Design a binder for these strands. Structure first.
Ligand SMILES: [Mg+2]
Ligand SMILES: [Mg+2]
Ligand SMILES: [Mg+2]
Ligand SMILES: [Mg+2]
Ligand SMILES: [Mg+2]
Ligand SMILES: [Mg+2]
Ligand SMILES: [Mg+2]
Ligand SMILES: [Mg+2]
Ligand SMILES: [Mg+2]
Ligand SMILES: [Mg+2]
Ligand SMILES: [Mg+2]
Ligand SMILES: [Mg+2]
Ligand SMILES: [Mg+2]
Ligand SMILES: [Mg+2]
Ligand SMILES: [Mg+2]
Ligand SMILES: [Mg+2]
Ligand SMILES: [Mg+2]
Ligand SMILES: [Mg+2]
Ligand SMILES: [Mg+2]
Ligand SMILES: [Mg+2]
Ligand SMILES: [Mg+2]
Ligand SMILES: [Mg+2]
Ligand SMILES: [Mg+2]
Ligand SMILES: [Zn+2]
Lengths: 136, 51, 116, 177, 60, 78
RNA sequence: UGCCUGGCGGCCGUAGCGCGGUGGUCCCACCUGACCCCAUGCCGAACUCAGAAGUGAAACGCCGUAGCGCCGAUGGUAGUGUGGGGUCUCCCCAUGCGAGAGUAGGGAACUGCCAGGCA
RNA sequence: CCUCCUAAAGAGUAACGGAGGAGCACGAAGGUUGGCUAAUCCUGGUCGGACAUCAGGAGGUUAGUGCAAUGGCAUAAGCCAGCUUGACUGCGAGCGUGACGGCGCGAGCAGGUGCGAAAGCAGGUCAUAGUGAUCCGGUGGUUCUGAAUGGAAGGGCCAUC
RNA sequence: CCGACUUACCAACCCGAUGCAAACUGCGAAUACCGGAGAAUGUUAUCACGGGAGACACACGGCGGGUGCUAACGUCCGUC
RNA sequence: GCGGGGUGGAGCAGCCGGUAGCUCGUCGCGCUCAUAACGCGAAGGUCGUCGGUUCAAAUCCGGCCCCCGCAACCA
RNA sequence: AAAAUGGUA
RNA sequence: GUCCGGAUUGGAGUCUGCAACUCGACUCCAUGAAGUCGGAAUCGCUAGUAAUCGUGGAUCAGAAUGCCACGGUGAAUACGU
């Protein structure tokens, strides 16, 4: 379950999630799972979607995870009011914008990755697409 | 803090004085400076005295 | 480097003379020769210049790298400035110590007529 | 100046032909000899460092420089700016006088002298040796010796690498094994 | 060389056991006598078998 | 619970006061700054708190100058 | 008038590093001696003085060479002021402004004053 | 009260928003003149070691700043020494920032001074925190006043607590 | 005393590629703001001084945000 | 939510940084026919667990876990 | 002054 | 910590014994450790005794600081229960 080993700051502004993504091409593998929609990827989702690929291919080939959950998301507990300070960090997310390549796979036939990426995409809250490496 | 106030009295007998601070515990020697006395309009010696 | 470390020693006084907008008498010293230049306040035009590499001065000197030569250059550069109506400069030791040949050159330039 | 004459009269012509140097200025020279004495046991008693200092002055005939800690280190219990050593720099004539005494008088007195390691060049032609016993220099009176001191001798050479630095010292019949 | 801070540095005479006499400058003051030098040391001058023990002792 | 934050300091109103080409009087502050982010050029002085002020009447002029590409403010006489 | 060298500048990497070569009449540098003027919290290393035997080794100057650094379009892209719109956490259209990065490419600085040497 | 972010590229801008600090220190840690340049790592070196002192190299400010953070700093504002008291008195064109009380910067003038050969620099400290109105009263100076008059008490002004 | 192999192994600095940042910046807009000049327009619309106030509980909508759950006809700012 | 803590095997100190102590317990020797008591001598924590600061942390600061107490209200 | 104890046959 | 002490170790040997590796005694040369009078506690001894110094024997090829004997010098103290 990915998480920064150390961070200079514990909490962070909510921010916004506008724009398109940087890192839209397949760089390390030959096939990729690209993000078509916009949203957040929780580290549990990235772990759950990676476990679905890694047993679908039976650990033959290699998996690259291109996103990292480095943004802490805090929540207030139940039945507390507003205010009285910012909440406590509960989990970490990655901000995903259209075109972001989420995973890459190599050492497998295409038909096996299209199935493996389909299982992973069932655990993710974002619309995805299957992409392959281009010579340029 | 531990740096308490002193007054520097002119040696010209004019009664003019400057006020500063000194750390007694590390500099127990009396402070001697050659300041300007506006009563005589000359630079004379100022000797430390208690505020 | 000696030359670079001397330039560092020199630039603090040179920038100050730029803000004052002062005419600058720049002395350069080598083990063999000594030099002098009076420079306009802009810094890019040389009014007068005397040095031991000129036959007018070097001819009357047994050696051009002693203090007796520095008094020759200091005297000559002062007279050349006086006939051009400078008469008021600021000495730029240019990184050398104000001592020996550099001091001897300024002393000649002073008693010859330059005010600094 | 006996070795300065020896260098200017026989060493150079030897190193002129051995390395086929274009200019005589290309032959390595000896710049300085620095004697170091780490007196890290001076934190307990300051007298020991001054006792070690007059020992070093008698060796070199030159007042040493009491060095002090560059930064505070926990392990050795020293503060920045505490005097924990001394050193001497020998140049010009004093360098050659001391170098002769080390070669001809001191190093034959080194107990069980099996030679000097030829591996002790730092890669730029500078030879650092260590002395276990200050009593190898006849200036130190064995009766008057209070504690066994040592000292660090370093020769700084113009040489560009170890190999031509080794040659220059060998020309002064330096006792490499 | 600054004045009056240095040990006295005067010419001495070093006479060795092997008869070599060398004139040097030093701070010791008196005349010095050497027992060994670079002209007489074993390392400087150049003066520094189980079967063979068996056969010699056990001739047969 | 409670908060361990909550402190701040009043704003110091730093920055550029007169801009490029502005006519200023002598002694008028041009830029208040922490440190010499701008440097004093001709007819311009620097205060103890690194405030830059005009030492003559004229126009403010900003220019990048020197080997370090530092910004300088100078006064151009009318 | 040209080549060279020194000083002071302008400009502030297209100008700086690297690599390879070249310079000693003059200049410059190292270099030689130091009781001295002066100096080292020890050291003539540095600063300084009196010089001129040697050398261009180092430093510096110049020449060449894209290994870097550096500069850098055109087009597109992102963003965005104004008006309008939607499927409104984000976008689209008209209009104006328009990057950053990267690409092609450029690129081994240019120049003023004075002084000296050789021609 | 100070520093950063929020804060939307002038200023300013809220929340029981997100992070830290101050309530001092220094007669040198202030002024000037002269000089100097860091962290770290590698190699060689007596004790000596991962880490002390020494020598050389690479590096290029990654150090340092009396104390937070930011903005600065090589002409160094960082490090070292000599001499010193400008950590001066009266003012002050002009400006900044505040509803105001107030707070800040300031060339130049007059008097006297320190360092420097000089040009110059110096009205505290790299800057921004280190603070408390008025009343009341204490201490020193100054006849300015002094309830018939001469003093005096008391008040005022100036310095300070 | 040295030391020698081996790796379910872990892995520094450097090198190449790939991302992220309110409290990162070797870059860098549009707008906004400050100043100058010019034309047209505007019942001086500007500034100063004096008389009289009231107000200092704001609401929602767009855009830029903090907080909340990018919940709230929520809460707190900026701007229209 | 707020205050207190965690240190040889146990119970308490040492917390303003430097240089870990007391009682019992444990071990060896002695006394005793033997054990206890007693006598002599010695060993044993490098300070709950990490991060930060510092030249240096049991000590200062911050998270984490554990063990404790106070408070957890008004309709 | 102090002196406690001794599994079974 | 010595011209005290003589442990340990290296080298060279001798003798006994078929055979000195484990595992003999002695000799030579070199080495030169702890140890500076010993905590609680505890032992022997009343006279030729204790202490101290040598000698011999049995066992036994070789292998005693042990055991068993022999002489030399030769104390102190016993108020008392
Ligand atoms: Mg010289
Ligand atoms: Mg060369
Ligand atoms: Mg571009
Ligand atoms: Mg080049
Ligand atoms: Mg702003
Ligand atoms: Mg704005
Ligand atoms: Mg407002
Ligand atoms: Mg300071
Ligand atoms: Mg200075
Ligand atoms: Mg200073
Ligand atoms: Mg400060
Ligand atoms: Mg009266
Ligand atoms: Mg009064
Ligand atoms: Mg209100
Ligand atoms: Mg409102
Ligand atoms: Mg509302
Ligand atoms: Mg019982
Ligand atoms: Mg023996
Ligand atoms: Mg002992
Ligand atoms: Mg004894
Ligand atoms: Mg009896
Ligand atoms: Mg006996
Ligand atoms: Mg027998
Ligand atoms: Zn000899």
């Amino acid at each position: 379950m990915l998480q920064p080993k150390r961070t200079k700051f514990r909490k962070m502004h909510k921010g916004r999630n506008r724009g398109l993504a940087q890192g839209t091409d397949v760089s390390f593998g030959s096939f990729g799972l690209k993000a078509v929609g916009r949203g957040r990827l929780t580290a549990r989702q990235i772990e759950a979607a990676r476990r679905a690929m890694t047993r679908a291919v039976k650990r033959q080939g290699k998996i690259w995870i291109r996103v990292f959950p480095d943004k802490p998301i805090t929540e207030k507990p139940l039945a507390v009011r507003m205010g009285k300070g910012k909440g406590n960090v509960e989990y970490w997310v990655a901000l995903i914008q259209p075109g972001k390549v989420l995973y890459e796979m190599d050492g497998v036939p295409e038909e096996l990755a299209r199935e493996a990426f389909k299982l992973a995409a069932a655990k993710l809250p974002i619309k995805t697409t299957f992409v392959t490496k281009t010579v340029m | 803090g531990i740096r308490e106030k002193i007054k520097l009295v002119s040696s010209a007998g004019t009664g003019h004085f400057y006020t500063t601070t000194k750390n007694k515990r590390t500099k127990p020697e009396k402070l001697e400076l050659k300041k300007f006395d506006p009563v005589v309009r000359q630079h004379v010696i100022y000797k430390e005295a208690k505020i | 480097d000696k030359k670079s470390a001397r330039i560092r020693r020199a630039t603090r006084a040179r920038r100050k003379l730029q803000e004052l907008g002062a005419t600058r008498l720049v002395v350069h010293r080598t083990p063999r020769h000594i030099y002098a230049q009076v420079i306009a306040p802009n810094g890019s035009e040389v009014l007068v210049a005397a040095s031991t590499v000129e036959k007018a001065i070097a001819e009357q000197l047994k050696y051009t790298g002693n203090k007796d030569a520095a008094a020759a250059v200091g005297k000559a550069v002062a007279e050349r400035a006086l006939e051009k109506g400078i008469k008021d400069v600021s000495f730029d030791r240019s990184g050398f110590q104000y001592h020996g040949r550099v001091q001897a050159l300024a002393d000649a330039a002073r008693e010859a007529g330059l005010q600094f | 100046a006996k070795l300065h004459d020896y260098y200017k009269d026989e060493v150079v012509k030897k190193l002129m032909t051995e390395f086929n140097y274009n200019s005589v200025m290309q032959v390595p020279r000896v710049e300085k000899i620095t004697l170091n004495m780490g007196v890290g046991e001076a934190i307990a008693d300051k007298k020991l460092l001054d006792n070690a200092a007059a020992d070093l002055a008698a060796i070199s005939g030159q007042k040493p420089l009491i060095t002090k800690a560059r930064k505070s280190v926990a392990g050795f219990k020293i503060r920045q700016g505490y005097p924990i050593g001394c050193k001497v720099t020998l140049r010009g004539e004093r360098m050659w006088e001391f170098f002769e005494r080390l070669i001809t008088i001191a190093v034959p007195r080194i107990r069980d002298f099996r030679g000097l390691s030829a591996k002790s060049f730092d890669g730029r032609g500078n030879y650092s040796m260590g002395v276990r016993e200050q009593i190898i220099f006849p200036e130190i009176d064995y009766d008057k010796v209070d504690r066994v001191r040592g000292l660090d001798i370093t020769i700084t050479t113009t040489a560009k690498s170890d190999e031509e630095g080794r040659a220059l010292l060998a020309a002064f019949d330096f006792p490499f094994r | 060389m600054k004045k009056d801070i240095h040990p006295k540095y005067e010419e001495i005479t070093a006479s060795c056991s092997c008869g070599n006499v060398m004139k040097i400058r030093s701070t010791v003051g008196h005349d010095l006598n050497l027992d060994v030098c670079s002209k007489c040391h074993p390392f400087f001058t150049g003066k520094q078998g189980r079967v063979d023990r068996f056969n010699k002792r056990f001739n047969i | 619970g409670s908060t361990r934050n909550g402190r701040d300091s009043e704003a110091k109103r730093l920055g550029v006061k007169r801009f490029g080409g502005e006519s200023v009087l002598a002694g008028s502050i041009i830029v208040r700054q922490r440190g010499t982010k701008f440097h004093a050029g001709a007819n311009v002085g620097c205060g103890r708190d690194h405030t830059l002020f005009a030492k003559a009447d004229g126009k403010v002029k900003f220019e990048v100058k020197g080997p370090k590409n530092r910004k300088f403010i100078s006064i151009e006489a009318e």
